[PDB]
Amino acid sequence: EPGLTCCICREGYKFQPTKVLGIYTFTKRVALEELENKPRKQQGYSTVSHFNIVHYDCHLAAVREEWESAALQNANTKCNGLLPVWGPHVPESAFATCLARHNTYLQECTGQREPTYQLNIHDIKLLFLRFAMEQSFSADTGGGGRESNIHLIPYIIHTVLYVLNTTRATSREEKNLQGFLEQPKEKWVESAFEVDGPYYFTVLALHILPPEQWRATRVEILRRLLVTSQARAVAPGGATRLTDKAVKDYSAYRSSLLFWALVDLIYNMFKKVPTSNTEGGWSCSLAEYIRHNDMPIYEAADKALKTFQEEFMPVETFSEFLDVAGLLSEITDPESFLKDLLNSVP
Ligand SMILES: [Zn+2]
C-alpha cells in the first residue's frame, strides 16, 4: 500500500478503496484570541496530532470513543478525536457520517456548542500559531512535533473546504475577506486585538483565494501582520491608535513573520493545483486535489517544513526575512519599508 494505511489492519485504499480513513487527533478548549481585550475571551479549540491513521470502522470495532484504548494505537500518545479524510472512491455518505462522528468527539472534549467551519479555521490558525510561536505540540499528548502536525494541516483544511462547499458559503466568505482587506489604516490597530483579525483572515484566504490571488495579496497581508505585531508589542492590553510607531527589536515581529511564512509555504505546496473545477473555484478545486493526492501532499509538506525549519526559523532581522521569503524583488529596502509602514498608521 503506497498511501495512507490503517495502523490496525495495515490496509489502505489499495485493498479497501471505500473504507474511511481517519487521523487520530487531540483537541482542547482554548481562547480563540489571547490578545482579545475582554475579561471573558471567546472560546474555541486547538487540535494537534501524531498523524497516526486508522479506519473509522476499525477504531469503532476495537471500541466494541474510549480514548484510553485508542492511545495504544496512537504511539502511546493521548487522543480524543478521529479526523476523517475523504478518499477518491469513498462514498460521500460514509465520509459525512464519520465527519459527524468527529464533530461529536469535538463537542465531548471541548464543551463546544457546535463545531463550525469558522471554528475549524480558528483551529488551523491556532495550529499555525504554535509553529510560529515555537510552542509545544507534545506537552499535552506526550508525543508529536512540527513533523506530525504539518501533515495534519492539509486534512483540517479539507474539513473546512468540505463544509464551505457543501453549504455554499464560499462567496459570502470572499466578501468577508475583501471587507478585511479594504479596512482603512485607521482600523488596523483595533483589528490587532479582534477575534476575527489578520491571523484569522489570512487562514481564510488560504481556503478561498487561488495561488495567483495570494501572490497579489500576500504583501498587503504582510503589512497587516507587521502592524498587528507592532500594536500587540507596544500595547498588549489593547489600543485603537498606534502611539508608538518606532521600529522595534525583531522579536516584536518574529512570530507574525513565521506565521506568514508557513501560509506562503503551504500555498507553495498547492502551487500547481487546478484553480477551478466543475463545481466551483479554489475552495472546490483544492478540496478535490487534497482528496486525490495524499502522497504528493505528504511529500510537499515535508519540504515545506524543511524550508520553515532550515530557512525561516533562523531569521533574525526583517531584511533577512525578505531575503528568505523571496520578496526582495518586490520590497527594495526593508529598513524603509517597515519604518514607513509603521509611521503611516494613525
Ligand atoms: Zn483498518
Side-chain angles (χ1 to χ4, degrees), residues 1-9 11-63 66-67 69-112 114-146 148-167 169-174 176-270 273-331 333-334 336-346:
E1 295 255 10
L4 306 177
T5 69
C6 169
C7 69
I8 288 176
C9 75
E11 294 192 324
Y13 298 141
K14 194 213 241 173
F15 294 130
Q16 300 291 348
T18 74
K19 206 174 292 188
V20 175
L21 286 166
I23 303 154
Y24 275 136
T25 56
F26 183 81
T27 308
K28 75 192 184 187
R29 171 184 272 242
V30 300
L32 291 178
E33 178 46 76
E34 294 299 338
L35 271 304
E36 184 181 12
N37 184 189
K38 275 158 192 177
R40 284 185 58 99
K41 304 184 184 317
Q42 196 175 340
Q43 297 291 297
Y45 45 85
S46 164
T47 300
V48 298
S49 178
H50 201 261
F51 204 65
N52 282 45
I53 290 159
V54 295
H55 285 118
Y56 251 94
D57 289 348
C58 290
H59 164 83
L60 287 166
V63 166
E66 176 81 279
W67 297 108
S69 150
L72 296 65
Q73 277 63 68
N74 197 35
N76 313 306
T77 68
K78 289 192 182 179
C79 47
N80 54 23
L82 185 53
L83 183 86
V85 316
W86 189 9
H89 303 298
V90 175
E92 183 168 2
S93 60
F95 173 72
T97 294
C98 295
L99 183 54
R101 285 176 185 149
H102 183 60
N103 291 333
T104 300
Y105 287 147
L106 291 180
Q107 278 175 322
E108 291 169 345
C109 69
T110 67
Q112 208 38 68
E114 49 164 21
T116 64
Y117 73 79
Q118 292 97 330
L119 299 175
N120 282 339
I121 290 171
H122 279 286
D123 192 351
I124 295 165
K125 183 209 66 185
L126 293 158
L127 191 52
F128 290 2
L129 279 173
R130 268 207 234 190
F131 283 84
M133 300 281 287
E134 292 200 49
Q135 290 170 357
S136 163
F137 301 88
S138 59
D140 297 318
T141 61
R146 282 191 293 269
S148 67
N149 281 279
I150 198 96
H151 287 291
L152 175 75
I153 285 166
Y155 300 105
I156 310 191
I157 286 174
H158 173 266
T159 71
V160 169
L161 297 180
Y162 179 79
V163 175
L164 273 180
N165 296 331
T166 55
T167 70
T170 298
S171 72
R172 261 205 314 288
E173 294 298 351
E174 285 177 304
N176 289 339
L177 174 56
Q178 183 66 13
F180 162 83
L181 294 167
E182 285 176 349
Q183 291 178 341
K185 274 193 178 166
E186 43 267 21
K187 176 48 187 238
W188 290 11
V189 175
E190 189 176 12
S191 84
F193 307 93
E194 293 178 331
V195 168
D196 288 358
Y199 288 96
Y200 170 83
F201 275 107
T202 298
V203 179
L204 177 64
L206 173 66
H207 289 82
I208 67 180
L209 295 190
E212 158 64 25
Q213 295 286 25
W214 166 252
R215 181 209 68 77
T217 320
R218 58 184 191 154
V219 162
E220 177 73 1
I221 295 295
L222 177 69
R223 293 185 185 102
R224 297 300 301 266
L225 295 178
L226 284 164
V227 170
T228 296
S229 295
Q230 182 81 2
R232 292 177 178 196
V234 306
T240 60
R241 314 281 141 230
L242 190 59
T243 57
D244 188 353
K245 318 179 186 196
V247 170
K248 300 307 181 190
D249 180 80
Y250 188 69
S251 58
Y253 322 103
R254 197 245 184 173
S255 73
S256 68
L257 299 180
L258 286 184
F259 182 90
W260 188 98
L262 184 57
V263 171
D264 194 64
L265 287 165
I266 296 163
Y267 262 114
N268 189 245
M269 298 171 47
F270 298 136
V273 170
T275 53
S276 314
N277 62 12
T278 311
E279 294 83 26
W282 177 244
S283 80
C284 287
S285 56
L286 176 58
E288 184 180 9
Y289 174 84
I290 293 168
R291 287 188 59 199
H292 286 88
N293 289 276
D294 287 321
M295 286 312 107
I297 286 169
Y298 193 97
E299 314 289 41
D302 278 347
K303 184 181 154 23
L305 179 63
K306 178 181 175 66
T307 303
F308 184 80
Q309 292 178 157
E310 292 185 354
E311 307 196 356
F312 279 105
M313 284 182 64
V315 165
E316 300 177 349
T317 76
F318 183 58
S319 302
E320 290 183 12
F321 168 78
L322 293 185
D323 184 17
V324 173
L327 286 172
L328 280 176
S329 75
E330 312 173 48
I331 300 173
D333 187 324
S336 167
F337 174 87
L338 180 54
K339 164 171 51 54
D340 295 342
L341 166 65
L342 297 182
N343 280 320
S344 87
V345 180

